[PDB]
Symmetry: D3
Subunit: 236 residues, 6 copies
């Protein structure tokens, strides 16, 4: 029935953007939350680390002439916005969700705390991690590996705009094939794009396997959770 009991779902801000060129598209987020809700109702404990690219865009231009760290702090503030909207959407579906921020925040969100988050998962709630790792110069993928290892998740579900890992950029090379399973070293030796070095190393060092898939492809989240053939499995 269920292959992965506890998962850390990594969603980029862009995933909530749909076709729009900025922000959150109501239809996309509803479709996404609903799909996550489905696996939760199947009893899966879900942890979500969400990015802020969809909202950073509106401030990307100015970022250029800003101190990178500061630009990154705005990015983190952007994730919190997606975290909030994401939670609101779950409550609408009858699923309770809690937002834990890596940087302490008064009323918008609870501060990250391992014991509480684990509990929340157990209590059947979706835990949404905001503000990445709390530090600049680190990617969302990195924050996903960190929270994943901390939450003792069975695997990290890296959701992307491609339904898996290809021998080469499929969107620009129709003859590209999707790997069904690959190793960390293989991914490296083959210069395959899975995630940034730092995040990749963290997943290895913590023995956190990764499944790359395309969330927007209706039904694949459930397929991966159930063990069907979907996306690429990267293991150590």
């Amino acid at each position: 029935q269920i292959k992965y009991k506890r998962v850390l779902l990594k969603l980029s801000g862009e995933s909530l953007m749909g076709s729009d060129p900025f922000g959150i598209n109501h239809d996309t987020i509803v479709q996404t939350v609903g799909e996550i809700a489905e696996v939760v109702k199947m009893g899966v404990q879900v942890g979500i680390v969400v990015g802020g690219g969809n909202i950073f865009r509106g401030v990307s231009a100015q970022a250029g002439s800003m101190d990178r760290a500061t630009a990154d702090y705005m990015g983190m503030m952007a994730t919190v916005m997606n975290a909030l909207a994401l939670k609101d959407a779950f409550e609408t579906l009858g699923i309770k969700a809690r937002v834990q921020s890596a940087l302490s925040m008064q009323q918008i969100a609870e501060t990250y705390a391992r014991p509480k988050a684990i509990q929340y998962l157990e209590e059947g709630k979706v835990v949404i991690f905001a503000a990445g790792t709390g530090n600049p110069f680190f990617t969302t993928d990195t924050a996903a590996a960190l929270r994943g290892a901390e939450m003792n998740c069975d695997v990290m579900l890296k959701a992307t705009n491609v339904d898996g890992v290809y021998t080469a950029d499929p969107k620009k090379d129709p003859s590209a094939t999707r790997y069904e399973t690959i190793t960390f070293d293989e991914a490296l030796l083959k210069n395959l794009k899975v995630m940034d070095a730092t995040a990749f190393a963290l997943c290895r060092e913590r023995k956190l396997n990764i499944v790359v898939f395309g969330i927007a492809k209706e039904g694949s989240l459930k397929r991966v959770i159930t063990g069907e053939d979907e996306g690429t499995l990267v293991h150590c």
Copy 2:
């Protein structure tokens, strides 16, 4: 020389958007900052309260489907992003600035604390207040009034897309006139929309005068603080 020593300048997030559809427009924010950097060098202590309408656009549509309290929190997060961008802008021009948030932030900003805010104002720095009043259901203009009165500002400068208060909409009828100066009661009596009732009410009770004025027009700010004829002055 100087008409107003300490001023609380209210900036809508939209005033940093320029002609863009969303976010922060580089040339616009650089222009606005520069103009304030001008009065600052003239010995004016300036506190800023900024909205998040420009960034809120990308999540506005979704907001409608969300709880309002949660929507306002996203609005407050948006203002933090503008506050950082603004703060960084000032540094580039050699001016020192600090970001105070109504809600506690870990490393993005310092929590609001009157004694320190006033402290900075004396040290001749720019203080940008973010997160508004820290509470949902309150408008940015109310935050400005709150902070303006708390900071013991000589006047609140309401920057807007108009150079003053008119007896009628000039854009949709070039036959009206720009009030040079009105009184709170007259404004209310003549249904002149200066700001929402709560915000407006606070200024009166704290006896904080307002000066509505378009900041896009170069020189406008420089004019108001010097005492020239510019924008409407709502006083008591």
Copy 3:
């Protein structure tokens, strides 16, 4: 049986003062807590926003020559004292209660957080909100509307020294009559005293109805909760 499931009870500090000229009168608070306990045991979820006038009195005089904001901060510190004593009194009756402060406090009380407070209500505990809205220049009534709207309460129970809304000050006009029901506009058109403008506007804008009643009039809290004829109902 029960007309209002979730209520925000607004108690002024003076209500806990009884006949004494300052502070908390043991007999009054016990009578008050007991009455609130009764409706909780009937299954009503109660949220309480409490004032500090009864304790502010001792420092009222000095306040006069103090900066208003500072005077207001003392008021907020006063509510926390009533919040504490109020909680202690419930624990004595076997009812668990939690104090959420609008301003973060280390060990005296938990910081306000919407998700937790809602939960507390559901868990059958009385939630007592202290420190108003966290900002100076705002009344307790305002803090009651805010928390009320945030807690999604069915109605706000404004407890006062009069058993309802009269055509004129009853304590000084024996021929005054009590309205059984009135509208927001009616209350305004008639210059009826319900609460301050800001708080009143917030209740309207959030569609939070109000029931004005006299808590000290033994048995009326239960009567209002049950639907009997008691106090004045102000709705939009």
Copy 4:
């Protein structure tokens, strides 16, 4: 010239009450502040620990019926109120003052942090410590000792309703004498109540000398810091 450079002055909340039955008496607080403003201008770094007995009166009766830990917390809240009032008083006389709380406060005060407190003392400001030790069951005098030793104060000044330590109660017998100077051991041996045992014990272990003295008597403070004959000196 100056006998004590840095001093930790202990003020009971009652010493701000004057002849009133409760709260803060305007003329009294203005008198007391003024007297300290005097030694401050003389280059004395002054830290203050204030009790809350004056405000605690209005809730004392109820306290008896409450848990003691909770009662002490209300006592600590009371001290914050006096701290603010005191702080404001100093500003009026042109003196800068900061309020450090043992327990974290959001905007009412700054959390205690030694490096900053000492910082202020050097900057020639008045530092008023509130919330005592931050723990229930500890007396105000213990907080004074704690802070006195932490601040590396030359001496702790215990202001009281008496101008010194006597061989017997002078009020209830005008035949005793005011010890000019005693030693901790002598005090204990002769059962001279200077302060509770814990507080007293701390001063000795940290080697912090005490100077009991009535502050109501004009000039008293001025006398002690200058070295004149005034109040008992408990030393080691």
Copy 5:
């Protein structure tokens, strides 16, 4: 069956040191946690205040030339380390444990809060109090009395390297006898070593009885909890 329902177990850092000359000895802590686990599974609610002498040793030498307060802060940081390891050890045995610090800490531990800790005990979890009282110049024993009184524990279990209270130092006087029961005054009159004055006074003033025993003596924790003859009972 069970004589003490809720206990505050005071463990010195040295107890976790075993024979080693520094730090935590895996075997000792496992033996200790297991023994505590046994009484928890019997339904006893356990509160633990732990010291840091075992880890302070490594920095004792440098402490000598440091400001005492600072030296004490390092001690508190040391308790947190034992608190952490202590918790980890319980989780391994299947017993949930929470670490509450007297000084607020972001992700390492929850800040001390009476309502939550009581709850935790009730929920069957072991609560471990770290950082003493939060202030320098106070012993661990003192922190044990404080938390004990706050948690309304039935008795404070002072674990030590001696199996009770002797007529004189047994390790250096073979003819020393163990008291089975003694009074506070008796302990004092006889100059018996139970704990430091401050801590002792606090236990008396709060009517918190004390049982002195040797935790390392396998099986005595259970014996004391069950009412058997073990250790010395000090009561008021």
Copy 6:
């Protein structure tokens, strides 16, 4: 005169241990501090990131049996202890220093905040960063890089038990040579272990140059900041 104006000096906890088996060795810490106190007086702004290996030794054995996240937290607590000891050392030599923690601490230290850290650096103070990145699974060297780049340091000084990077281990073969200067890519290509990959990767992306060098050797630090030939320089 000065080669590097602002430097981020990385100190392993072991470098404060001297020849001892654990903890902090008085003569060693006094020597190391003194050496830095030297370059500071020369107008060099110095930020420090210190590890906790020296203190972690006493809990290392137990760590193996604990969850790694929890082990790393104990490691971070250890670094706070070294930070305090270090800070105190500087005071003794008349130098002012402040301790910034990645994780919020109540009174032991100030929470990390870039604007203030840079503030201090300009005020000519020593800033000691503790708790590393604030996240588990990240090495001390990564924290150094993070902070180094955040602080806009001219270079990161990696103090170690070796005076530079060699073509081969000199200790286990006196036939190699100390690279005078290498480039990131060369280092990686030649498998020269300078620091873990993540840490190393960050320095390159932020363009932060490293200068590996043994600090035990008196004069070493003094040499590097002046520009003399000392230790390997890994640049881009």
